[PDB]
Each structure stands twice: as C-alpha cells, then as structure tokens.
Motif scaffolding. Structure first.
Motif, PDB file in Angstrom:
ATOM      1  N   UNK A 144       0.871  -1.176   0.000  1.00  0.00           N
ATOM      2  CA  UNK A 144       0.000   0.000   0.000  1.00  0.00           C
ATOM      3  C   UNK A 144       0.912   1.231   0.000  1.00  0.00           C
ATOM      4  N   UNK A 145       0.481   2.310  -0.642  1.00  0.00           N
ATOM      5  CA  UNK A 145       1.286   3.534  -0.672  1.00  0.00           C
ATOM      6  C   UNK A 145       0.379   4.753  -0.558  1.00  0.00           C
ATOM      7  N   UNK A 146       0.835   5.770   0.166  1.00  0.00           N
ATOM      8  CA  UNK A 146       0.053   6.992   0.289  1.00  0.00           C
ATOM      9  C   UNK A 146       1.007   8.141   0.033  1.00  0.00           C
ATOM     10  N   UNK A 147       0.670   8.984  -0.936  1.00  0.00           N
ATOM     11  CA  UNK A 147       1.515  10.117  -1.293  1.00  0.00           C
ATOM     12  C   UNK A 147       0.757  11.430  -1.385  1.00  0.00           C
ATOM     13  N   UNK A 148       1.462  12.516  -1.080  1.00  0.00           N
ATOM     14  CA  UNK A 148       0.881  13.836  -1.196  1.00  0.00           C
ATOM     15  C   UNK A 148       0.906  14.103  -2.687  1.00  0.00           C
ATOM     16  N   UNK A 149      -0.049  14.867  -3.196  1.00  0.00           N
ATOM     17  CA  UNK A 149      -0.086  15.108  -4.627  1.00  0.00           C
ATOM     18  C   UNK A 149      -0.547  16.511  -4.983  1.00  0.00           C
ATOM     19  N   UNK A 150      -0.005  17.485  -4.258  1.00  0.00           N
ATOM     20  CA  UNK A 150      -0.310  18.896  -4.454  1.00  0.00           C
ATOM     21  C   UNK A 150       0.630  19.438  -5.528  1.00  0.00           C
ATOM     22  N   UNK A 165      -2.548   0.603  -4.066  1.00  0.00           N
ATOM     23  CA  UNK A 165      -2.021  -0.649  -3.550  1.00  0.00           C
ATOM     24  C   UNK A 165      -1.700  -1.563  -4.719  1.00  0.00           C
ATOM     25  N   UNK A 166      -0.488  -2.104  -4.742  1.00  0.00           N
ATOM     26  CA  UNK A 166      -0.092  -3.029  -5.806  1.00  0.00           C
ATOM     27  C   UNK A 166       0.328  -4.369  -5.193  1.00  0.00           C
ATOM     28  N   UNK A 167       0.255  -5.427  -5.980  1.00  0.00           N
ATOM     29  CA  UNK A 167       0.583  -6.758  -5.493  1.00  0.00           C
ATOM     30  C   UNK A 167       1.644  -7.428  -6.347  1.00  0.00           C
ATOM     31  N   UNK A 168       2.461  -8.272  -5.729  1.00  0.00           N
ATOM     32  CA  UNK A 168       3.459  -8.997  -6.498  1.00  0.00           C
ATOM     33  C   UNK A 168       3.867 -10.286  -5.804  1.00  0.00           C
ATOM     34  N   UNK A 169       3.905 -11.386  -6.567  1.00  0.00           N
ATOM     35  CA  UNK A 169       4.265 -12.729  -6.112  1.00  0.00           C
ATOM     36  C   UNK A 169       5.742 -12.783  -5.778  1.00  0.00           C
ATOM     37  N   UNK A 170       6.069 -13.338  -4.624  1.00  0.00           N
ATOM     38  CA  UNK A 170       7.458 -13.437  -4.233  1.00  0.00           C
ATOM     39  C   UNK A 170       7.789 -14.866  -3.820  1.00  0.00           C
ATOM     40  N   UNK A 171       8.916 -15.359  -4.333  1.00  0.00           N
ATOM     41  CA  UNK A 171       9.339 -16.715  -4.037  1.00  0.00           C
ATOM     42  C   UNK A 171       9.875 -16.848  -2.631  1.00  0.00           C
TER      43      UNK A 171
END
Ligand SMILES: *Cc1c(COP(=O)(O)O)cnc(C)c1O
Ligand SMILES: *Cc1c(COP(=O)(O)O)cnc(C)c1O
Lengths: 365, 365
Positions: A144-150, A165-171
């Motif tokens: 999950x990520x939260x950024x200011x965007x002014x 929020x992004x997802x990625x498979x990890x071994x």
C-alpha cells in the motif's frame, strides 16, 4: 483528515489484457513482477473519492507533485499466504493498518478508516486470487502507498493526495527450505535515524539515504548493515529488519532480547509476533532492553551468545553469523547452535501462516 | 558519451498551445504558476539519452518507481532576474550545479556534467524568456529535479533515472514593496537533521517531516521554525533558510556570525554570498561559529544583539523579530535597529541581481 472512503462504494474494472503469469519453475525475484489489478483512491477538498480496483497501469503525476519534491510519501508491506486447502490469508493485517495511519498523520496526509481500507485490500487480492503462489515458502507481497499530490512547490500540507495498492508474487526467501546466514557491517559513521526523528515510521525518506551505505557494506564483503546509535554504540536495526539476540545475560538467565521502541526503531509486525510467541512458551525470559556493542563483545568472548537474527516480512527470521566491527571480525555461533530457536520460530510461523494450524492472527480473504 | 548528455544534441519541441501568462497586477503565489516548457533527460543502465525541451506536461511513472517508495529524489532552487536593461541573468548558478551533483552522488543517482546541465537550463529559460517578470522584486524560480525511476520494490541503486527542470514566475517575498519580520518557534523536541545524517543535502526526505512541525508553529503563533540541535541547543537553521546573527560578541567586538558547516546545515548559496560580501567590506568581523540559545539569551539581556535574520533564495534576507523559546517570549530588536544591515545586504543584492551593477556572480542567459 476527513471522513473515510467506503469499501461499499468500490468500483471494479477488470483488465482487458491479463499479464502472463510467472509459471511454475520460474525465478520469482522480490518485487519485480506485478499482478493484473491495483487499488486507487484519491483525496482533495471534498474529501475522499470512491475507491476503485482497476487494471495495473502507470500513474500520471504533475511535475510539481509534492510527493516528488518533498517526499510526502509513506508505504506499508505485508504478506498473504495460500494454504494447501487453497485458502488465502493475510498475516495480522490490523497492525499494518495502524502503522500506516500513524505514518500518514506524521506527514499530515489524510486519515482514513483502517477497516474500510482492509476490506478494499481483501477485494483486490480476491480479484487477483490466482496470482498467489502455492509452492513452499512463497506468498503474495502487498504494497500500500500513500503520497501527497499537491501541484505546488510550497512546502506545506497537501490539499490533494493519492492512495494506491499493488501486489506482487514473491518466491521463498530461502530456496530449498534451508536458512542461510548474512554478514553485517557495523560502522558508527552511519546513522539511519535520531531520537526526535522519524525513523520509527515507514516513510520513504528513511530508505533513500541507506542505498549508499548498503553498497559500502557489499564492497567490504558484508550482505547487510547493522545500524548503531549513540556514543555507547547500541544496536538498533539490521538493514530493514528488527534485531534479536538469544543469549545468557550477565545475570546468568537465559533470554531473548530486542531493543525497545525508543523512537529510533520501526515497530515491526514480525518483531511483535516473536515477542508474543516467545512470551507464550514461558520457557525463558523475553525482554525489550538496550543492547550495546560492548555487551555483545563481552558475551561473545564469554561464549554466552547462542543466536543472533533479524526479523521482517521479507525474511521472517534471518540468521546472522558474522559482524564486521571496527575492521574486526566477530564470528557469531548462530549456525553451529542449530539455529534451534530460529528453526522453531520458523516452523511455528509456517504452520500459522499456511493454515496448518487455526489461529486468530490470520485474516481470511 | 554515455556518462553525460550534452547541450549540443538537445532536441526541441516548441509547444503548440501557449499558456496565459499572469499579469503584473496579479498575485503570484510562489510555486503555483508554471511556464510553457520543461527540460527532460532520462537515464538507464546504458547511459543518458538526449536532452529535450518540450511542452509542460505530466509525468508517467510506473507505480513501483523507487522515487515514490524510497524517496530517491533530490532538487535544487535558484532564480533568474530580468535586469532593467531587459537582460535575463542567473545568480551564481555554478554553486547550485555543484550542490546538485553532490546530492545525486549521496543517493547513488547518475552523475552528469555540471556545465552541460547549466547550458540546457539556459536554453530552457531562453525559450521561455518572456515568462520572466520585470516588476520590482519579481523573478523566475528554476526548479531542477533528479529522481530514481526503477520499477522495482527492492531497496537498491536505480538502473533508471529521470532529470527534469520546471520554471515558475514568482513575486517579491513578504509584503513586496517592503521588509517584514517573522516569529520563530524554538522547541528542542524537533530535530531536522543529525550529524552523520543527510541534512546538508537538498533531498526531498529532509522536508516531508517538517510539515507537521510548521503547523505546530502556526498554532503556537509563529510563522517559522527555529531548528535547534544538541544538548546545548545550538541554532542551525530557520524553516528552509540559513540563520545569521549581527551583534557585539562577548569579547566586545562587533560581528556577524552564522553556524559552521558541520553536517546539520545546508550550504546555502545566499549564505555564502553574504559571507563573501561582508568580508569584502572589511567593516566588522565576519565568522562562522556555533551559536547556542544561552549565548543568544545573555546577549539579548545585555542588549548586545542588533539584528537576526534568515537567508535563502525564496527570501534573500528575512528579518526575525521574535522567538518563542520554552514557552517564553524573546523580543529581537531587529526592526528598531533599522534593520540597517539587512537593508544594506538587500540593496546590494538587488543592484547585482538586476544588472544595475556589473558583477561576475551573474550568469547571462
Ligand atoms: C518494514 C521494516 C521493519 C520490519 O517490519 P515488519 O512489519 O515486521 O515487516 C523493520 N525495520 C524497518 C526499517 C522496516 O522498514
Ligand atoms: C534551499 C535551502 C537553504 C538555502 O539555500 P539557498 O541556496 O541559499 O537557497 C537553506 N536550508 C535549507 C534546509 C534549504 O533547503
């Protein structure tokens, strides 16, 4: 800090062109392969917009976005595991939602509802349920990520923000099931955080400066950095993991210790889970106390040290066998002693995380 | 070749849809209005691409860009002035190019040729020359930025980077046609940077954490934050400006003192220009030396303090008239004393920056 968004208002847009799955037998490197969808929620004047799950795609940022100039950014990290019963589960998600809310508030970013966000993340994983690996030691990393965007160059509270929020498979961290040690470089010259600082939050700004120090470690032949703080050279963290020491204290008692949350330490979720788990066995003293290099050095020369390890989502439990301190090699007996405790923590987390054993820490998707 | 782009192979793409330039009779909020074009140069494992000037537009970033997760970002800030003779000039650009290169290296970002970059910025400005204001106290703010851009969640050296520069017209600070003081909140609880830290570089990560502290100042009735460091509460910086004190020191000598460059202080360009200018007059002692709150208090009671001010590109010379320390008001005589020195520095910078007087510090566009 306005009224949260609701998972009930969730708009879902399935992808047109599904990415090609990795496929059994292929190299899964940490955080390099992403799933088909992502979560996105924007914020501005009227508060939050409706959350939406959509195809994985690039972000469109205004060149003056405060997230790129003043580092108004924070992130989280957790895992989801698929048991043999094909069920997917998240490990103590609640602790991450709390940590994220605190980080947001420290940067003056919009607060939100912890449970609403959790539900939205569950829906996202639900949509890409097929991406979750089921081999051995594999899992889905949630970011999950939260950024200011002014779009302003003024150093101030953002009036616009963005949460995705992004997802990625990890071994498996340890290919083969066998845990392997890491060497650490301990140099007082490097300071990742100061009291009254912001090192106890998961903010982007805390990691950029560490890249150079990590390279300096590699050149010296070490895999990770042991962060020391203060004139008394107290141990705080290892790379991006919490540090634990399994030894016989000066008073003759057998114990497990980790540095206290004094402000220069990130409250790890795995860290808290180890303390809880160890407290429950009631087999030895489990305490949060300051640890200094001298104490470590004395214990090492007196042979009272048994195992030293790092903990974190990436590497549940990570054995340490060597520390380079003041151009001097300190061999840590971790592997010659088992690593018994480490192996136990590992086995128990695996049974809980993969559903072999029913437990309240797991969150069903 | 590879290791550095050149102004010689710069590609131009004039915009084909100009923007409405502000009017003299209008506001001009610091970093809110941007010009028509921007500079852009990309980098990867190979080397640099060709630099290009193009229409102002949004950036397309991969959601996993390290610039958004680990704060691999740094920026610079400088001004260009439209001389009375219609000529546009940059103020000591070379110092900014150097500072930027150092910041880049601290974050393991690609190095480049300082002069090539300078030339590209000059072209950019030339292209948007008509955007530079010619009122009084107005100028063009130049904002170069360098960010890591590798689409990986691994905390490591980027293999992809992005360098851009944007421009925006800004009006004279504080009142515009005058000079007004600011109150400062001095609270030891807040630490901006630490020794062995990275506060002496212009990195995004150093500002995000300051937003909350600035709000805390406003609610306490102060416009800016006075950053104190160490048990001895030494003065380091003011908001985003260097701090100077004009007084009669303990030894009965009249001097101008600013904190030394010991690591927790950003090497200001205006700061260096004040020291140079003052040393040239040879009218009083000009030194760099530690200053502590206690020293400041004693001097305030014995009435040895004359003027206290902050310096930076945004506000060349900024008067300070009040400091709130330990819930106690300290009135600073800056305004009642003229501020004679502040106005002299101001006058001289204005003549140099606006071309009234020929000087080697000015760079013609
Ligand atoms: C993420 C992180 C940890 C460990 O936290 P976990 O929640 O257990 O993953 C420890 N230290 C730092 C600096 C971290 O970023
Ligand atoms: C930009 C900046 C300064 C002043 O530098 P100038 O080059 O003179 O503009 C001082 N302190 C901080 C923290 C800054 O970011």
């Amino acid at each position: 800090a306005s009224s949260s968004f609701k998972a009930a208002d969730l708009q879902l847009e399935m992808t047109q062109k599904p990415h090609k799955k990795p496929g059994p037998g292929e190299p899964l490197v940490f955080g390099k392969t992403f799933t088909d969808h992502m979560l996105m929620v924007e914020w501005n004047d009227k508060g939050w917009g409706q959350p939406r799950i959509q195809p994985f795609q690039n972000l469109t940022l205004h060149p003056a976005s405060s997230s790129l100039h003043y580092s108004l950014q924070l992130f989280e990290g957790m895992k989801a595991f698929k048991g043999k019963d094909q069920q997917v589960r998240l490990f103590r998600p609640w602790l991450n939602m709390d940590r994220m809310l605190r980080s947001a508030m420290r940067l003056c970013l919009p607060s939100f509802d912890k449970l609403e966000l959790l539900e939205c993340i569950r829906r996202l994983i639900e949509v890409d349920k097929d991406w979750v690996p089921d081999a051995a030691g594999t899992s889905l990393y949630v970011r999950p990520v939260l950024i200011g965007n002014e779009p302003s160059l003024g150093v101030s509270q953002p009036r616009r923000a963005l949460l995705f929020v992004i997802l990625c498979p990890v071994g498996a961290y340890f290919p083969g099931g066998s845990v392997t040690p890491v060497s650490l470089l301990a140099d007082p010259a490097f300071i990742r955080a100061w009291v009254g600082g912001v090192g106890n939050y998961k903010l982007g700004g805390n990691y950029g400066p560490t890249v150079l120090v990590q390279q300096e470690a590699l050149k010296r032949g070490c895999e990770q950095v042991l962060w020391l703080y203060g004139p008394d050279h107290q141990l705080t963290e290892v790379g991006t993991m919490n540090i634990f020491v399994y030894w016989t204290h000066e008073d003759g008692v057998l114990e497990l210790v980790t540095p206290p949350l004094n402000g220069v330490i990130l409250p790890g979720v795995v860290r808290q889970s180890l303390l809880d788990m160890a407290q429950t066995w009631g087999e030895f003293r489990v305490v949060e106390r300051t640890i200094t290099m001298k104490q470590l050095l004395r214990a090492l020369e007196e042979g009272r040290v048994r195992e030293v390890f790092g903990s974190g989502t990436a590497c549940q439990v990570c054995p340490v066998h060597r520390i380079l301190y003041k151009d001097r090699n300190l061999h840590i007996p971790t592997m010659e002693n088992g690593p018994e405790l480490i192996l136990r923590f590992q086995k128990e987390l695996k049974e809980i995380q993969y559903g072999i054993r029913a437990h309240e820490w797991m969150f069903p998707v």
